[PDB]
Amino acid sequence: AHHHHHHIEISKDENYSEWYVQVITKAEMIEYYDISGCYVLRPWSYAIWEFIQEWFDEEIKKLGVKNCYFPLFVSQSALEKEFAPEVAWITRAGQSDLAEAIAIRPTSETVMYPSYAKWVQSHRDLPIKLNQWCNVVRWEFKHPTPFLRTREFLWQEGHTAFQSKDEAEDEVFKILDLYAQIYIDLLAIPVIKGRKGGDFTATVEAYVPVNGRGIQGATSHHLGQNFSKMFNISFEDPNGGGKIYAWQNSWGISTRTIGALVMIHGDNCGLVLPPRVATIQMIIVPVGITKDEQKTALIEKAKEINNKLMDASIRAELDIRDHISPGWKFNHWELKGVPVRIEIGPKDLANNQVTCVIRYSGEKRTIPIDGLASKCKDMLEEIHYSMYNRILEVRESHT
């Protein structure tokens, strides 16, 4: 099976739910697990989350947010301050039954806010801006789907507290725009910003052409003073007003991002990676291979190109495995969605050129080796915006 060619066995436009399973399995993104609704994130899909993590982590740090880590556990009575058929319960640990069951966090408000109440002694302690990258568990009763609705998933959740409503409201929309940027500028997915235990909730919605539905892609909550009154997160007003309750937001985005990417950009040849989150942006494949002197000169030139592409900060890799055919390589990296295949054979070598095959469109482009690296940087940008505009044109048609 591994060293054999592979086909997406059903068309996206015929049965998208079965097509979806084909793509995520044949592109080596997940493994099914014997605990239902949990899925292994294989490196090919986990790398996409790492790119999102690295980007968003840099952006919120510019806003003053610091990372932390709160516990996985919340006691039953602490959870039930302020859904119940979605909680996993620990009732035994070590050698003893617990007198009170412990919940796995489905979200961390009731884990974090007793500490926020302790940390806020005066307005000088505000703002508090904390984020954590972590796993949460929701025993989802709707049917689980890899990435889109899983019972364990990875996310970040940010939890912020301010001395005034206006600071908090301003951050809600900055965060919301950062979430839109993840979809638009990292995943090439157009989104709409909209207002859905808080004062107001805003999401980014990603339209899915094949079924006409919208993916709730991330959530930004303005909690007002609802949680700060619940947990007594308060300070003395400097201007005589007495006890003032902190103004709070929380916000989160998950590995559902990766399911949106599959649903929207996947096609009948398999995954199509948005270039900015592709762990391999360009795969270099030797083609048309006799002569010992020729095979060396050709592989040596491929190594040169590979180094020149990485010098230009392109994530290029070379596939010079000889126990497997070029045609198998084409198919493997197509199924996995590598944005560009660079083919180099004897004919192209003699013309000091390569042949680039663009995955999302199938276009073949012959390019001189001279200014190649710069031409490839441009091409990866071209692909990103073309992927985006193609979905945007589909959405602005149905709407």
Added chain:
Amino acid sequence: AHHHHHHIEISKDENYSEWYVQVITKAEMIEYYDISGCYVLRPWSYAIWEFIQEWFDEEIKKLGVKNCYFPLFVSQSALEKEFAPEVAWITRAGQSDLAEAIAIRPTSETVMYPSYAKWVQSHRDLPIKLNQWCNVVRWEFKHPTPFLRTREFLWQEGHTAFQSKDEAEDEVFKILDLYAQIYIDLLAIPVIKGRKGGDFTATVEAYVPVNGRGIQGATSHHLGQNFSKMFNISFEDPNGGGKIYAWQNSWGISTRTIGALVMIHGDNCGLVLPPRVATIQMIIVPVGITKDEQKTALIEKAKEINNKLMDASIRAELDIRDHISPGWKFNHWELKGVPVRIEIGPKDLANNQVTCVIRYSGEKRTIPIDGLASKCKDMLEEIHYSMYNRILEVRESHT
């Protein structure tokens, strides 16, 4: 309490266990949590883990290791292939009792290796080199201690599989040396490499001067073929030998690293941060402050210095809060272990110099502003090696 001065209330050499609690609380490293043996990682301590994570993640990627994410859950019968009084058990989820309890992973061998068995169809599928940054849970029956022995902790665990014993054994010792480098070159802690369900186990041991004990700082396992026979991770030998079982290692380091740092470098003034894992390496504090024209010229020069230190890639920050005294600032950043305080007042300003106060030793150094940034880069190196050599001299004395 927050805007007041604070003292470590008991000496390290008098009661190190109570001294330890003083330091980790007053340096804002942790919060105690109402589930026993779990502790909040506040930003000041979580940033240390982030530095270790970023460094080690870069090193194992050079060895070909890829990141992934396997589930939190392992079914009872899968765990009990191959300690029991240390497992947290889920017995109810959503609306139903489970027919079989689910364990929180205490480690991920039994979560991962059924997938390894599926992925290894031939020797061409090897090596497999996977790592995950994640949380695990052990209901530790010995008494829990922040960082050193917690019931939830963060770690990485790497799990590798090779076609030959020699490849696997070579990686065991490369990983072990990377763990030694974390202690030696990031935390300024000398370690000894030693050989403790595997074929052999190697650890790095950090000597703790105040009580004479050794911290098991990380673990590198050579599993041989024990787990690959258990899980049938095997391939056909190309040379006629028949079924061959993969040769496996696993290896892990946790947030226990941070407890070693506190135990070994902490002193009676509080935390002392090894410079290479200090989120603030240098804190700039205006001292000796009347004149509106003078206060601006002094804060403006401090901002200049701060920018020049960051241009040199030094993690400098400026503390120009005016609602709190310089003496409070000295004490706050000492308790938190900032490697160097840079004091600038009117007298130094007129001599175009600053006064640096080195935290681990108390030494005060007057330095011209001219070549300051380069002098500070050197100083942070000097501090790292001096911290290391001071502990090494203590260990080579007791031994």
